[PDB]
């Protein structure tokens, strides 16, 4: 439950992400296409964590090999970050339950929910730029930190490491479009309103995909997947459904040859007659 | 005034033909029937709904909602 | 004229019973009750909506929409 993410190069990045995925989850029988899969996080009970050290961003040397990220195992949520220099693990308010041995623990005022680091930083994911520079800067932003308050520039630093670790762990789409900023020239990844819409619908996608069976399309919320190789090229690991459920007990409906989240379908099959509006 | 922002915890159809919705910690009702399918839809798809009234205490009525 | 094209960012039910929709980064409202479920369904399901009108500035009204 200690892993690393190697920001040295394009191929060393996905090696890190993959090694963490294989370690954390098992592939789905019906969603494989060339060793790349959609896998579902394993039952682990219940406040289990992983500490993933960030190791790269220096390219030529070996600086910055401090700072590790704590991520709950079932969630892929970030509980907080350790500072391996000062040996202090800064845990978010809503993450009180999970404790790692030895390291000092400073419970903070504010929680991890993206609404919070967006408000108290400045930027919002969507429009947000993440490069190799912005990661070094975001690294130094967390080494200079102490207290239980959460500054503006430390809320920026978590919003960027969240996007490129736990977020890209989840979605192969973020992995691909970000790994660009690692090789020569700093191309600079921009988080598009499309990648952001994927992170909000994570749990919903998770509940649907297990029931897929070569069904051409998949339809969940505002998100569409035209074939098996658009799922595969977007989602990498999903929550375990056995948060997960919004209101239903029916996860899915097969309509024509498309798998709909039954809830998205219900939400446009509950309209009154329509001539009934004339009675206003 | 922005009274409660959040997802709909529950819905209720009432005997007087008004629709009740629970957001944040607090119940709110609307007497607009147009809003009934629109709110049930936001509840079904976990939309963050933001309820706007001139009176904000639980048990107040609204006729204005933002769907995110 | 075609005024905005894109997905519905948010939607808002208003106290005068009209419905405001946000396409691109600009706001539009309609008085047509029929358009309420049609638009909200396009929002729910990520349909591409193109708003059509004679005045195109944010805060303008419409009653013509293309749904893709």
């Amino acid at each position: 439950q200690e892993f690393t993410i190697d920001f040295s190069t394009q191929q060393s990045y996905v090696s890190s992400l993959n090694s963490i995925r294989t370690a954390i989850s098992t592939p789905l029988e019906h969603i494989s296409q060339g060793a790349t899969s959609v896998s579902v996080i394993n039952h682990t009970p219940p406040g289990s964590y992983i500490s993933v050290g960030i190791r790269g961003l220096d390219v030529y040397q070996e600086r910055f090999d401090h700072l590790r990220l704590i991520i709950e195992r079932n969630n892929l949520s970030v509980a907080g970050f350790v500072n391996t220099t000062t040996n202090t693990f800064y845990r978010f308010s809503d993450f009180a339950h999970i404790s790692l041995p030895g390291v000092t623990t400073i419970s903070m005022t504010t929680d991890s929910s993206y609404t919070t680091p967006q408000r108290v930083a400045a930027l919002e994911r969507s429009g947000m730029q993440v490069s190799r520079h912005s990661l070094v800067s975001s690294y130094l932003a967390l080494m200079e930190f102490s207290g239980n308050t959460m500054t503006r520039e430390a809320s920026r630093a978590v919003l960027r490491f969240v996007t490129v670790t736990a977020q890209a762990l989840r979605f192969r789409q973020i992995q691909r479009e970000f790994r660009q900023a690692l090789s020569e020239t700093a191309p600079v990844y921009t988080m598009t309103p499309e990648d952001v819409d994927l992170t909000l619908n994570w749990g919903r996608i998770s509940n649907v995909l297990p029931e897929y069976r070569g069904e051409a399309g998949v339809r969940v919320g505002r998100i569409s997947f035209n074939n098996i190789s658009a799922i595969l090229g977007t989602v990498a690991v999903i929550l375990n459904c056995h948060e997960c459920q919004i209101t239903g007990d029916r996860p899915v409906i097969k309509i024509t040859n498309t798998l709909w989240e039954s809830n998205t379908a219900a939400a446009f099959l509950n309209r009154k007659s329509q001539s009934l509006y004339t009675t206003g | 005034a922005d009274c409660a922002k959040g997802k709909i915890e529950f819905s209720k159809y009432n005997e007087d033909n008004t629709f009740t919705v629970k957001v944040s910690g607090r119940e709110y009702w609307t007497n607009r029937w147009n809003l009934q399918p629109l709110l049930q839809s936001a509840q079904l798809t976990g939309m963050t709904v933001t309820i706007i009234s001139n009176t904000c205490s639980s048990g107040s009525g609204f006729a204005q909602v933002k769907f995110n | 004229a075609d005024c905005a094209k894109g997905k519905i960012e948010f939607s808002k039910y208003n106290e005068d019973n009209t419905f405001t929709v946000k396409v691109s980064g600009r706001e539009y409202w309609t008085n047509r009750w029929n358009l309420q479920p049609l638009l909200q369904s396009a929002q729910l399901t990520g349909m591409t909506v193109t708003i059509i009108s004679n005045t195109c500035s944010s805060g303008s009204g419409f009653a013509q929409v293309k749904f893709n």
């Epitope: 009675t279 206003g280 | 007087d16 033909n17 008004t18 009702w29 609307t30 007497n31 607009r32 029937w33 147009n34 009234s53 001139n54 009176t55 107040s60 009525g61 609204f62 006729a63 204005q64 | 106290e15 019973n17």
Partner: nanobody, 121 residues
Framework: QVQLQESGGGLVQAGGSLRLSCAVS????????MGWYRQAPGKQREFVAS???????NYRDSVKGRFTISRDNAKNTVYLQMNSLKPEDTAVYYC????????????????WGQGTQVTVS
Amino acid sequence: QVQLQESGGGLVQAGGSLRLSCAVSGSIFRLSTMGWYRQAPGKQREFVASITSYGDTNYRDSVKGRFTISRDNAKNTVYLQMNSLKPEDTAVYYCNANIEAGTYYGPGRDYWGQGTQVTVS
């Protein structure tokens, strides 16, 4: 089967305080923008104050600051707290229920209470 039952109000020396209150039949309370209208001897009916389903207050200028209208949607009742009265505020005060648009009941329809005498000296 709709009834608006008023109570309160009578005689009070000028610069005093009276609380009018109307209990509306359950059927239409949540559907109505509640209001008060007054008729002074010699004149026709004046608008006084009204509050929508969603808590929005409106008033006649000669009342602003002094009276405040309110709802308790639990008790199905409407309040008019009158403060610092003056002889021009002498009239028969009618409680009003006015059905809101977008309720599919009977938009704009008006109901009335029997009437209450309020006199100031």
